[PDB]
TrEMBL record, chain A:
Residues 193-243 are annotated as: Heptad repeat 1. Residues 105-118 are annotated as: Fusion peptide 1. The gene is S. Residues 222-266 form a coiled coil. Signal peptide: none annotated. It comes from the Viruses. Residues 169-274 form the Coronavirus spike (S) glycoprotein S2 subunit heptad repeat 1 (HR1) region profile domain. The record marks R104, S105 as: Cleavage. Glycans are attached at N6, N90, N347, N371, N407. The lineage of its organism: Viruses, Riboviria, Orthornavirae, Pisuviricota, Pisoniviricetes. The chain holds residues 697 to 1126 of 1257 of the full protein. Disulfide bonds join C27-C49, C32-C38, C305-C316, C355-C399. This is Spike protein S2.
C-alpha cells in the first residue's frame, strides 16, 4: 500500500459566463429609412416585428434574471470587518479595502481591466438604424457588494448562514471541521497551523501572477462580448444589399420610378431585411439558451461550493474540496477553489486483518500498516501511525478463513 | 470631399452628407427622430400618469434631439424643467417622476439600479416616484477567537 | 473526419480502467496510490454502510458473482439490438438531413425550371434575372433551415456530453452517494467503454 | 421491521451520445455550381454564406 506523508494546499481558478448584453431593435427605422411610403408597404406584412420585439424583450428580461439568480443568495449583506486576524489567514486580497478608491477588491479590480468591453464609427451606424443596447439592471457596485457580503460571512460565520441564521465560530475551528470533513483527523491542522496559513497566503498571491502576466485565461468570458459586437456589425452591413433590386437605397428607387413600378422592387428589399432580422433573432435565442444553461451551472456551483462543502468528485477544484471564494467579473463570475492534495508517498506492507488468538480483528477508519519492525494502524490520507488497541479494532467472526490474514497481538489497556 | 464628390455614403449605405449645388458647402443628414424613448406607466385602470425616459442623451439638450419647436403641444411639458421633475440618471433621465432617497424593493425596473413605483408616503398620492433599489440590510456580525 | 481516432479513445478508456483497479479512485485527486483490490472493495463496502466483514468472509462468492454478472452483458448485448437506439438515431438523423437537402435542388420555386442551364439557354439576360432570383432565394432558405436545425441538435448534444462528462468524473474515478445517478442499487464502481459517437 | 439476510451484485449498462458528425458546405457550388452568370448575382445578396 502507498500512504502519503505530506500535503499541499492549492487554489484553482475557473470562469464561466452568467449573462450577456441586452439589445433592442426598431423595425420602422431598420426596414425603412423614415420613408412614409415605405411604412405603409411594411404595414401590410402582419405582426412579424411584434414577434421580434417580444423575443428580444424576453431575452433582455432573462439576462437580468440570470444575474439575479447567481449572486443574490443571502438577502442580508454583512459588514466587512476592519481586522483580518483569522488565525494567520490573509483575506485582504479578496475583500474590499478600507478607504478604497474603487468599491471592489483587488483581484476583481485586476480582472476588470483584463477584459475589454469596447470618424466612421460603427456605433453611429448602429444608432441611426434602430440598434440600441440597454444597460443592465444591477450595476457592478451591487455585484461587488454581494460578493463582499458572501466573503465576509463565509469567513466569520462558516457555511451555516446559507441554511438558517448565521452562527459565530472561530476560523481555526471551522478549518478543523472542514479537515475532518475531508477524512483526515483534526490533528494535522492544530499542529501545523502556521504552515497552513503561510501556504494559503502565497497560494492566494500566485493567482495575481497567474492572472496578470498570462493572457488567454478569460477567453471564454471575452468571446461572449465579442460575439454580440460581431453579430451587430454584420447586421448593419446587410443594408447595402440589392436583394435583386436595382439599388440598395430606397431613395434611388422612389425618385427614379413611378408608384406602380415601385412596390415590385421595394418588396425585395423588405423581404431581405426581414429575413436578416429573423436570422439575428434566431441566433440571439440560441445564444440566450446557452447562456441560461451556463448561468444555472454557475448558480448551483455558488449554492453548493460557497455556502457549503461538497463531497462530489471534481466539482470545485482538482483535489479534496475545502471552500470557495466568489469574485465578480464583467458578464460572469470567477471561483477560487481551495483544495487539499497529498504530495509525497511511501511504500508500506499491509494486511487485511489480524488474528490474535483465534479471532479476527478488523480496523475502523484506517488500515494496518507496519513500518519495518512491528505493525501499526493509520488513516489513509495521512501517515499518522497509532498503536493497535482494542478500541481501534472490533472482534467479528473467526480468523480461520480470511485471505491474507497475519498473526499479531492486540493491546488491552486493562 | 473630393472635388467631384456630390454626396457621401455610410457603411450601411445611406447618405449622411451632401454638397449644396448653389453654394459649395457641406451639410450633414441625420434622422429627425433617432434614439430610444421609453414610457413608464402604472396600469390604465389606475390613474393615468406617465414618465418619459430618454435612453442615452444628456438632459440639458432634450429639446435639441426631440425638436420641440414642431412637436405637439402636450409634448412640451415632457421636455422642460419648469417643474422639479427632470433629474439625470445613469441610463438617461426621467421626466414626470420625482426622486426619493429611501430605498425600496424594485417594482418597475428602469436600469442602472433605479426602479419606479406608484404612490409615496410623503403630499403625493398619484405621482410616481423613482428610487434606488435595495439589495438587503446591514447586519454587521462580530468576530471573536473564542466565541 | 474527427480529430480523435477510435484507437486513442480506446487507449483513454484502457488507461482509466487500468488505474481504477490497480490504484483505486485516488489517482484522479492527486497522484496514484497503490492499494490491493480486496481492500479497495472493502473500503467501498464500508462506504455503502455495511461493515467490511461481509466481503472478507464471502470474497469467493463476490468474485464468482461479479465474473458472471459481467458475462451476462455479453448475452444482453449480442442478442438484443434495441439498447443502442439512442446511439443509432444520432447517426440516422445526419444522413436523413443531408439526403433531404440534396433533393431540394429539384424544385422550381415558382420558376420555369429547376435547372439553371434551361433558363440561361432559353432566355436573354433581362428576364432570366427574375426567374433566377427565385431559385437563389429558395436554395438560400433551404440552407438556412438546415443550419438552424444543426445548431439546435448541437445544443442538445452539448447538454448530453456535459452530462456524460460529469457522470465520468463522479462515477468512474469516484464513489457517488447520490440516489440513482449511476445504477439502481448502491453504487460501488463504474467502468467506461468506448462507443461510436458515445 | 424488515432486514435483508442476503444480497446480489448487478451490472447496469447505460448509453448516451457525446458528439455528432462534422459537416461543411460550399454555397458557390450548391446554389449555382459552375455557372458564372449567377455567381455575380449571389454576390449581390450580402454575407449570408459567411
Ligand atoms: C511538507 O511540505 C512543506 C512544503 O514544501 C514543507 O515545508 C514541510 O516541511 C513538509 N513536511 C515534511 C514532514 O517534510
Ligand atoms: C496581507 O497581505 C498584505 C498585502 O500587501 C500585506 O501588506 C499584509 O501584511 C498581509 N497580512 C495582514 C495580516 O494583513
Ligand atoms: C514503491 O515501490 C515501487 C515499485 O514497487 C517504486 O517504483 C517506487 O519508487 C517506490 N516508492 C518509493 C517512495 O520508494
Ligand atoms: C518503527 O516504529 C517504532 C515505534 O515508533 C520505532 O521504534 C522503530 O524504530 C521504527 N522503525 C523504522 C524502520 O522506522
Ligand atoms: C498463526 O498461528 C497459528 C498457531 O498459533 C498457526 O497455525 C498459523 O499458521 C499462524 N499464521 C501465520 C500466518 O503464521
Ligand atoms: C447661383 O445663383 C445664386 C443666385 O444669385 C447665387 O447666389 C449663387 O452664388 C450662384 N452659385 C454659383 C454661381 O455657383
Ligand atoms: C379596476 O380595478 C378595480 C379593482 O380591482 C375593479 O373593480 C375594476 O373593475 C377595474 N376596472 C375595470 C375597467 O376593469
Ligand atoms: C453629458 O454631461 C457630462 C457631464 O456634464 C459630460 O461629461 C458628457 O460628455 C455629456 N455628454 C454629451 C453627449 O454631451
Ligand atoms: C436626498 O439626497 C440628496 C443627495 O444626497 C440630498 O441633497 C437631499 O437633501 C436628500 N433629502 C431630500 C429630502 O431630498
Ligand atoms: C445468497 O445468494 C447467493 C446467490 O444465490 C447464494 O449462493 C448464497 O448461498 C445466498 N446466501 C445464503 C445465506 O443463503
Amino acid at each position: 500500500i502507498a500512504i502519503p506523508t505530506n500535503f499541499s494546499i492549492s487554489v484553482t481558478t475557473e470562469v464561466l459566463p452568467v449573462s450577456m448584453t441586452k439589445t433592442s431593435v426598431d423595425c420602422n427605422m431598420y426596414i425603412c429609412g423614415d420613408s412614409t411610403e415605405c411604412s405603409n408597404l411594411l404595414l401590410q406584412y402582419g405582426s412579424f416585428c411584434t414577434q421580434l420585439n417580444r423575443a428580444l424583450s424576453g431575452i433582455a428580461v432573462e439576462q437580468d434574471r440570470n444575474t439575479r439568480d447567481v449572486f443574490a443568495q443571502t438577502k442580508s449583506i454583512y459588514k466587512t470587518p476592519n481586522i483580518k486576524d483569522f488565525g494567520g489567514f490573509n483575506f485582504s486580497q479578496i475583500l474590499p479595502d478600507p478607504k478604497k478608491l474603487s468599491y471592489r477588491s483587488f483581484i476583481e479590480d485586476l480582472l476588470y481591466n483584463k477584459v475589454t468591453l469596447s470618424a466612421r464609427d460603427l456605433i453611429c451606424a448602429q444608432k441611426f438604424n434602430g440598434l440600441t443596447v440597454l444597460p443592465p439592471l444591477l450595476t457592478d457596485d451591487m455585484i461587488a457588494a454581494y460578493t463582499a457580503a458572501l466573503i465576509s460571512g463565509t469567513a466569520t460565520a462558516g457555511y451555516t448562514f446559507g441554511a438558517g441564521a448565521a452562527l459565530q465560530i472561530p476560523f481555526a475551528m471551522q478549518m478543523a471541521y472542514r479537515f475532518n470533513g475531508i477524512g483526515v483527523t483534526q490533528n494535522v491542522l492544530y499542529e501545523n497551523q502556521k504552515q497552513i496559513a503561510n501556504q494559503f497566503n502565497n497560494a492566494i498571491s500566485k493567482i495575481q501572477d497567474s492572472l496578470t502576466t498570462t493572457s488567454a485565461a478569460l477567453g471564454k468570458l471575452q468571446d461572449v462580448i465579442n460575439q454580440n459586437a460581431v453579430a451587430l456589425n454584420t447586421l448593419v452591413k446587410q443594408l447595402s444589399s440589392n436583394f435583386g433590386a436595382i439599388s440598395s437605397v430606397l431613395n434611388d428607387i422612389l425618385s427614379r420610378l413611378d408608384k406602380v413600378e415601385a412596390e415590385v422592387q421595394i418588396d425585395r428589399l423588405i423581404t431581405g431585411r426581414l429575413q436578416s432580422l429573423q436570422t439575428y433573432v434566431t441566433q440571439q435565442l440560441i445564444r440566450a439558451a446557452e447562456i441560461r444553461a451556463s448561468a444555472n451551472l454557475a448558480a448551483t456551483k455558488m449554492s453548493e461550493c460557497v455556502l457549503g462543502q461538497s463531497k462530489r468528485v471534481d466539482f470545485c477544484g482538482k483535489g479534496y474540496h475545502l471552500m470557495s471564494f466568489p469574485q465578480a467579473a464583467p458578464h460572469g463570475v470567477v471561483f477560487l477553489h481551495v483544495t487539499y492534495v497529498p504530495s509525497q508517498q511511501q511504500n508500506f506492507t499491509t494486511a487485511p486483518a489480524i488474528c490474535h488468538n483465534g479471532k479476527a480483528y478488523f480496523p475502523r477508519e484506517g488500515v494496518f500498516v507496519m513500518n519495518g519492525t512491528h505493525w501499526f494502524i493509520t488513516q489513509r490520507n495521512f501517515y499518522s501511525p497509532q498503536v493497535i488497541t482494542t478500541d481501534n479494532t472490533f472482534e467479528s467472526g473467526s480468523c480461520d478463513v480470511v485471505i491474507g490474514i497475519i498473526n499479531n497481538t492486540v493491546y488491552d489497556p486493562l | 470631399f473630393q472635388p467631384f464628390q456630390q454626396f457621401g455614403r455610410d457603411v450601411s449605405d445611406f447618405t449622411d452628407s451632401v454638397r449644396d449645388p448653389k453654394t459649395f458647402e457641406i451639410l450633414d443628414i441625420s434622422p429627425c427622430s433617432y434614439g430610444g424613448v421609453s414610457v413608464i406607466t402604472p396600469g390604465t385602470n389606475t390613474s393615468k400618469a406617465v414618465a418619459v425616459l430618454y435612453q442615452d442623451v444628456n438632459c440639458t439638450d432634450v429639446p435639441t434631439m426631440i425638436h420641440v419647436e414642431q412637436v405637439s403641444s402636450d409634448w412640451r411639458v415632457y421636455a422642460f424643467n419648469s417643474y422639479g421633475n427632470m433629474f439625470q440618471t445613469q441610463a438617461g433621465c426621467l421626466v414626470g417622476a420625482i426622486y426619493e432617497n429611501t430605498t425600496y424593493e424594485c417594482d418597475i425596473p428602469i436600469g442602472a439600479g433605479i426602479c419606479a413605483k406608484f404612490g409615496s408616503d410623503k403630499m403625493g398620492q398619484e405621482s410616481i416616484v423613482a428610487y434606488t433599489m435595495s439589495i438587503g440590510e446591514d447586519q454587521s456580525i462580530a468576530y471573536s477567537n473564542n466565541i
